[PDB]
Design a binder for this molecule. Sequence first.
Ligand code: NA
Ligand code: NA
Lengths: 250, 250
Amino acid sequence: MARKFFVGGNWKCNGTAEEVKKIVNTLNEAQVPSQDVVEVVVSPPYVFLPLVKSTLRSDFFVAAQNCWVKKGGAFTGEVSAEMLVNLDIPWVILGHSERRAILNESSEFVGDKVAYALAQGLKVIACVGETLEEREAGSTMDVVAAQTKAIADRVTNWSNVVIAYEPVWAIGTGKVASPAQAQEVHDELRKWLAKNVSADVAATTRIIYGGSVNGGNKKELGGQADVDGFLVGGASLKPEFIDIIKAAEV
Amino acid sequence: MARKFFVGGNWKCNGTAEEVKKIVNTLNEAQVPSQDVVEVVVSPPYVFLPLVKSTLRSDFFVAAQNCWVKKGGAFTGEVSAEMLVNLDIPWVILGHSERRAILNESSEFVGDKVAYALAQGLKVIACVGETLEEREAGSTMDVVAAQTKAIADRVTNWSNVVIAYEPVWAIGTGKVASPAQAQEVHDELRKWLAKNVSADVAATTRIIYGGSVNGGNKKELGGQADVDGFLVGGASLKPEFIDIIKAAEV
Ligand code: NA
Ligand code: NA
């Protein structure tokens, strides 16, 4: 069965109570393709997770932007996966490029987070991606395979995993990734999954594009053979997020 | 005037909606010394900050357990100081030993957080403390002074700062640090403020003890000349937190 298009919206470290109410209302009024056609996840900061879950339309789902690597306890400042389950938050973003780079989350740390989140019943958007230095060194697939392998070695089930490829080398560097460049990485990543995990896992796992997506490139990006949707950054705070969801209609 | 006793309760990475309701109800029914005698702050995980703020007695105050180093934006998983202000959360804990050690927060990173939080109008519990290895090397005051200096170099107004000394070394040594051991560090820390900031800042800044506090030592610790209260860990989840608040009555 074909992979269901997936659109996640990462709000990052943004939001006020008034802004969140506006974003949620605009999402609630949106008219988008059916749940059979597209799966929509929105990810507010921790402090807004109960508010968004309590007010968002029930056919869009809520994600935390991170969670802790293991059971709760003496980890001041962290939020455990079981906390998210207690609050009926079904999804979590793990390994986002900003946490790998600015907060120095290693691939093994991320992989341990994915496994623990899955073991608590969460669904995971697992992020991978190479930097500009890594791409110019010709290490793109070496880096992305190593990041993916660290996850693969630690999980027991891929059913509730979505992989997000982030072309970090293009974000904020001035460079711009083409739909062909994105398809190139996605194809190779899915090929890695078929070889190293299983053909079934490669065929069924959504691999979403985490680079710059707008009205101009959304159709061409979403139509790529191995691109199954988007992990949206800043546009997820804006009405145009709805336009990006509408790319699922083909 | 004498420094007002200060009792902070750090819930760390603990709590369910059900357990939070029980904790808050027990706090709300507590009968403790007057607000002139003791200042009480409780610190839930991010996802419970709105819930606790909306239900807790107005004479106890709410703290976040961490916040981001600067303005919000592209920092997936982080919570900015201006978010805390937007949610009417007045306090934040910064530099907790678990974040310095496990999450590798540097003294300069902590210092920049303290300054940014103060600039946004938050009050700050700034945490310092040496490891077992550092204490056994003879570097207790070298370490505590260096951590404090990184904050002092970035802070111009200390009015809304409380310093918490955490004897991190006492977890490894399995030792109940004696009241004399707390007093000697607190005294040297206050003397450091007098010489490196000002006599007035030394005289007015609360320095609270972040080691293990129980019925056998709460009076003895609180009665020390340079100990102005407690930063409680796991006991803050339990009714015994109220007995620690009651140590302010002398
Ligand atoms: Na596609
Ligand atoms: Na005292």
